Design an enzyme around this catalytic site. Structure first.
Site, PDB file in Angstrom:
ATOM      1  CD  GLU A  22      -2.915  -0.843   2.386  1.00  0.00           C
ATOM      2  OE1 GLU A  22      -2.523  -0.229   3.414  1.00  0.00           O
ATOM      3  OE2 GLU A  22      -4.080  -1.283   2.225  1.00  0.00           O
ATOM      4  CG  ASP A 128       7.462  -1.002 -14.064  1.00  0.00           C
ATOM      5  OD1 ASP A 128       6.947  -1.187 -15.197  1.00  0.00           O
ATOM      6  OD2 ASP A 128       6.789  -1.008 -13.007  1.00  0.00           O
TER       7      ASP A 128
END
EC number: 2.7.10.2
Length: 258
Positions: A22, A128
């Site tokens: 999270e 990424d």
């Protein structure tokens, strides 16, 4: 020495969550607004965290999201500077999308290329790079983030043979440029992963997005060269983008979308 005690952190507002954990907005030492990225218990041992976190610790540039601190005992926290406007992807698709034109968009791209130009000098690889991993702050500031596949953003060599290099990052940047110019649309509309990999191996490249100047699509295409070494550097990408409206498109006129 990046290490702090957990109770130094006030986790306040949940911002989102991903496959690894999270992200919360929070307060550090009662005084400093921060973001915390929580890692799911069992993702990584403390000894294994030290080995991989070396990179985020050594990178310090104004266009990379700045690491502040670390809690390296389960559950592991990563404390970084707080970017007020969320991901570039959300920003592009949201209410702001509407008003962004080429000058803002190219300026965002330049900031990103600058961030990656720093990574390039440092001899690291991102792996990424995509709009979802760029964060936006006030004043249209963008910073590269996230250092924990998505084939549509990944260079052929890297998707197929694990050849991840700064040049595979360059390829992703070219894809990022289509995100910026389409206001956040997923690349290769209509195509699934396999169809993309097949087509790209056969030489398919995304066409010039509507209202996007051919000169910028040329840049995308240079980022997408089959041969990693043909691909331009981020040093070049950064300078090209900063200078774009004088050196490359001196006669640019605003349109309906770009």
């Amino acid at each position: 020495a990046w290490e702090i005690p957990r109770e130094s952190l006030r986790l306040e507002v949940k911002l989102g969550q991903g496959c690894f954990g999270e992200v919360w907005m929070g307060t550090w030492n009662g005084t400093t607004r921060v973001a915390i990225k929580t890692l799911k218990p069992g993702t990584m041992s403390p000894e294994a965290f030290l080995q991989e976190a070396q990179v985020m610790k050594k990178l310090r540039h104004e266009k990379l999201v700045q690491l502040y601190a670390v809690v390296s005992e389960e559950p592991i926290y990563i404390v970084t500077e707080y970017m007020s406007k969320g991901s570039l992807l959300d920003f592009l698709k949201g209410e702001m999308g509407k008003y962004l034109r080429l000058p803002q968009l190219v300026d965002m791209a330049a900031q990103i290329a600058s961030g990656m130009a720093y990574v390039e000098r440092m001899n690291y690889v991102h792996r990424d790079l995509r709009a979802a991993n760029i964060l936006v702050g006030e004043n249209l500031v963008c910073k590269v983030a996230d250092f924990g596949f998505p084939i549509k953003w990944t260079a052929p060599e890297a998707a197929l043979y694990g050849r991840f290099t700064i040049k595979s990052d360059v390829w992703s940047f070219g894809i990022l440029l289509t995100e910026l110019t389409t206001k956040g649309r997923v690349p290769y509309p209509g195509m699934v992963n396999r169809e993309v990999l097949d087509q790209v191996e056969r030489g398919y490249r995304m066409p010039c997005p509507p209202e996007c100047p051919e000169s910028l699509h040329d840049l995308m295409c240079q980022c997408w060269r089959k041969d990693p070494e043909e691909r331009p550097t981020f040093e070049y990408l950064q300078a090209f983008l900063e200078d774009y409206f004088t050196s490359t498109e001196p006669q640019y006129q605003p349109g309906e979308n770009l």
